[PDB]
Amino acid sequence: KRHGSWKIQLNATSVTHKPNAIQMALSVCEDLISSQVYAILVSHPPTPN
Amino acid sequence: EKENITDPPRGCVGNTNIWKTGPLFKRVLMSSKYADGVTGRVEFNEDGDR
Amino acid sequence: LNIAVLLGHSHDVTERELRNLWGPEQATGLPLDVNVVALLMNRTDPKSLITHVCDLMSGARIHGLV
Amino acid sequence: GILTTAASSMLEKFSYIPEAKASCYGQPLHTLHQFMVNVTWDG
Ligand SMILES: *[C@@H]1O[C@H](CO)[C@@H](O)[C@H](O)[C@H]1NC(C)=O
Ligand SMILES: *[C@@H]1O[C@H](CO)[C@@H](O)[C@H](O)[C@H]1NC(C)=O
Ligand SMILES: *[C@@H]1O[C@H](CO)[C@@H](O)[C@H](O)[C@H]1NC(C)=O
Ligand SMILES: *[C@@H]1O[C@H](CO)[C@@H](O)[C@H](O)[C@H]1NC(C)=O
Ligand SMILES: *[C@@H]1O[C@H](CO)[C@@H](O)[C@H](O)[C@H]1NC(C)=O
């Protein structure tokens, strides 16, 4: 809205829970390195582990 | 503002081509001085915290 | 035991001398089911590291990584 | 040599020292971490 008139755009990608902790980072790497992300934020308090 | 556009490439297929502005954009994380926020005045210190 | 040994791309080391580095050696071999798996890699990425670790851990109970 | 020495000298204490995990998908006791503090191979 207020960040100028430059032709940059934004796309959203959020990955959800997996019970296995290795496949968490596996889904993250194959879904965000191919997406060429610039920042990674994790917001999960309610994990049983 | 200061252009130097570097992009993290697809490292999933045999690539170790490192991202040049790694620390430099981290400098942007170190110099992220703001005052607008519902939590409060968000600003990063020398430890990179609130 | 079953031990997997994989390498990168430096020093131009081929694979057969890694097979022969274990075979006639280990004269005082007290465990019976000892086997090495000497492999190489065509890439330099952690994706294939995760993939080959999860394949070789299911690959007939490998207990060692080098 | 260190791995075979650890497996040999730990086989004499307990039999089923090899205890591997089946798969990474779908989600031990005797380890060698407290065993190879000091080991000797070929002098
Ligand atoms: C943009 O995001 C959507 C939803 O996360 C995703 O399906 C798509 O692959 C992304 N990339 C493009 C084409 O902009
Ligand atoms: C961008 O950075 C390079 C070094 O990586 C430097 O040579 C160049 O002067 C910089 N460009 C400017 C002035 O924004
Ligand atoms: C922290 O404190 C004030 C106290 O009124 C509060 O309103 C606000 O959320 C925060 N502001 C700052 C300075 O971060
Ligand atoms: C060569 O690379 C391909 C693709 O990952 C792989 O299937 C093959 O096993 C590799 N060969 C060796 C010996 O590294
Ligand atoms: C390791 O060293 C300790 C003394 O520091 C010794 O008591 C022990 O026998 C050695 N480890 C072996 C061979 O079990």
SS3 content of chain B, % helix, strand, coil (to 5): 20, 5, 80
C57, D21 contact by CB (below 8 A): yes
Say if CB C44 and CB C8 are below 8 A apart: yes
Contact D3, D41 (CB under 8 A): no
Dihedral angle computed from the Cα positions of residues C36, C40, C43 and C46, in that order, rounded to the nearest 10 degrees:
20
- Name the residue of chain B whose CA is nearest to A4's CA: B1
The Cα–Cα gap between C9 and C5 comes to 14
CA-to-CA dists, residue D40 to C27, C63, D6, angstroms: 15, 21, 10
Give the residue, by CA position, lying nearest to ligand 2 atom 10.
B4
Q: Solved how?
A: cryo-EM
Angle at C57 between CA C55 and CA A49, to 5 degrees: 105
For residue D38, the CA-to-ligand 5 centroid distance in Å is 6
* Token pair 């503090």 in the structure block, residue: D37
Residues whose CB falls within 8 Å of the CB of residue C13, separated by 6 or more in sequence, listed in order: C7
Resolution of the entry in angstroms: 5.3
Cβ atoms within 10 Å of C6's Cβ, excluding its own: 17
For A29, nearest residue in chain C (alpha carbons): C47
Indicate which ligand has the atom closest to the C-alpha of B37: 3
Residues with Cβ < 8 Å from C53, sequence gap 6 or more? C65, D24
Q: List subunits contacting chain D, requiring 3 or more Cβ pairs under 8 Å.
A: A, C
Cβ–Cβ contact B40 with C under 8 A: no
Q: How far apart are CA C21 and CA C8, in angstroms?
A: 18
- Interfacial A residues in 7-36 facing B (CB < 8 Å): 29-30, 33-34, 36
Using DSSP, state whether C57 is helix, strand or coil: helix
Spell out which residues line ligand 1, taking CB within 6 angstroms: A 11-13
Place of tokens 């060692």: C64
Closest-CA residue, ligand 3 atom 6, reads B40
Tell me C12's DSSP state.
Answer: G
